From Swiss-Prot, chain B:
Domain of life: Viruses
Gene name of the record: S
Sugar attachment sites: 15, 23
Whole-protein coverage range: 695 to 744 of 1273
Name of the protein: Spike protein S2
Function: Precursor of the fusion protein processed in the biosynthesis of the S protein and the formation of virus particle. Mediates fusion of the virion and cellular membranes by functioning as a class I viral fusion protein. Contains two viral fusion peptides that are unmasked after cleavage. The S2/S2' cleavage occurs during virus entry at the cell membrane by host TMPRSS2 or during endocytosis by host CSTL.
Length: 106, 50, 170
């Protein structure tokens, strides 16, 4: 409706008997392949991303936002737990870091 | 010739692979919309008979 | 073919030119309408040869290789169910190309989600695309993943009901 791509903002310009809209949009570019999974199995529990998607670069698993590649460590802060690992089809095994663990470890 | 609808592109779909963008382009596009016309009035008596 | 009639008709001026121009405008408008509705993608996408979509069946909407027209069963049913100076201009886009455009749109929305409409087509698994759509309407991803078989069965049943309803209602 407001340009091709993900719409950010628009500018109006007057024209004889008309209006010209300059649509400023965000277009994704330079995409890269990653290996993906619906959920991460840790401690017999299934972890799902709160806002992102699980990606793998070949050996390590990360969670990133859907529209830009920004890999982050899979923690309890960006994932939520629902159910065990027996129901979700395609769940893979990976560790889930806990931020609270070094605090009581030390 | 018979027209070509578009360039062929086969998306590499698989059950466990995703494509994530690593960059972006800020694209500005133009949309031209007419708003009004010339306001014309015709004197019917003058036009038909003068 | 009456010359006297044409000679008398010339006294009335450019009425014929106005009528022909109006009809020409309507005729180009129809092609513009078809171009706006169907030609919204510049890449012709195709589905993968293996139809593994996590239990989701799209046979009724994907093109049938057996048919010469390369139409879907639903599209074939739709085409079957529709039945002095005059000339009929052919449409600029044939039925095969319109079917090809719908096929490209279906392949893009199945294999790439909504990414192809906003930029390059980025592949994503269909049970992840459905989870994204579930998140769009305010339902968590886990609900989609846990009940994937039931949702796929319901979707297939609904598509079959759509084909039966179209075939059974005049
Ligand atoms: C996937 O990304 C991870 C994170 O960067 C990579 O792990 C790093 O690998 C480099 C190169 O060997 C090391 O110097 C770093 O110490 C590693 N970091 C961690 C946290 O282990 C990993 O190698 C990448 N995998 C591939 C196949 O490229
Ligand atoms: C992911 O981890 C689970 C649990 O550790 C693995 O499930 C085990 O699989 C072995 C061999 O198939 C069985 O003997 C165990 O009884 C299973 N444990 C449970 C709790 O079910 C699973 O195989 C792992 N997956 C991968 C790909 O390594
Ligand atoms: C992700 O991987 C797939 C498969 O490895 C790539 O798809 C191939 O792309 C090349 C280059 O256009 C084609 O010649 C192959 O035929 C494609 N394979 C299939 C199965 O379609 C895809 O290009 C990769 N994505 C990126 C961004 O590089
Ligand atoms: C993302 O794309 C932009 C293009 O807009 C890249 O910026 C270019 O980078 C090259 C090499 O670093 C320069 O020669 C160009 O002049 C840059 N263009 C502009 C407009 O600044 C950017 O480097 C890309 N980033 C990544 C991570 O790929
Ligand atoms: C997808 O759905 C189609 C049609 O709903 C299935 O095709 C049917 O398969 C059964 C079993 O062989 C046949 O008895 C029917 O006659 C088929 N119907 C049609 C219209 O061809 C198909 O098996 C389903 N699954 C896949 C993976 O394509
Ligand atoms: C993808 O399909 C392969 C078979 O081609 C199967 O072994 C694998 O488990 C599947 N992965 C997912 C996440 O469905």
């Amino acid at each position: 409706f407001c340009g091709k791509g993900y719409h950010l903002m628009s500018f109006p310009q007057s024209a004889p008997h008309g209006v010209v809209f300059l649509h400023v949009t965000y277009v994704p570019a330079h995409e890269k392949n990653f290996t993906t999974a619906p959920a991460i199995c840790h401690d017999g529990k299934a972890h799902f991303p709160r806002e992102g998607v699980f990606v793998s670069n070949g050996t390590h698993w990360f969670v990133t936002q859907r529209n830009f590649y920004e890999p982050q460590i899979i923690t309890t802060d960006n994932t939520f737990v629902s159910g065990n690992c027996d129901v979700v089809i395609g769940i893979v095994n990976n560790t889930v870091y806990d931020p609270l663990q070094p605090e009581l470890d030390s | 010739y018979t027209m070509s609808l578009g360039a062929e592109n086969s998306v590499a779909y698989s059950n466990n692979s995703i494509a994530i963008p690593t960059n972006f382009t800020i694209s500005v596009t133009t949309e031209i919309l007419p708003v009004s016309m010339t306001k014309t009035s015709v004197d019917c008596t003058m036009y038909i008979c003068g | 073919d009456s010359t006297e009639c044409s000679n008398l008709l010339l006294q009335y001026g450019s009425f014929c030119t106005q009528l022909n121009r109006a009809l020409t405008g309507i005729a180009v408008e129809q092609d513009k309408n078809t171009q706006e509705v169907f030609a919204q993608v510049k890449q012709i996408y195709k589905t993968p040869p293996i139809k593994d979509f996590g239990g989701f069946n799209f046979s009724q909407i994907l093109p049938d290789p057996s048919k010469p027209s390369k139409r879907s069963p639903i599209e074939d049913l739709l085409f079957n169910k529709v039945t002095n100076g005059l000339t009929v201009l052919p449409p600029l886009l044939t039925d095969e190309m319109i079917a090809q455009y719908t096929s490209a749109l279906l392949a893009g929305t199945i294999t790439s989600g909504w990414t192809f409409g906003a930029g390059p087509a980025l592949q994503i698994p269909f049970p992840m695309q459905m989870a994204y759509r579930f998140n769009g309407i305010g339902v968590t991803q886990n609900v989609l993943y846990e009940n994937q078989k039931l949702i796929a069965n319901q979707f297939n049943s609904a598509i079959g009901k759509i084909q039966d309803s179209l075939s059974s209602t005049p």
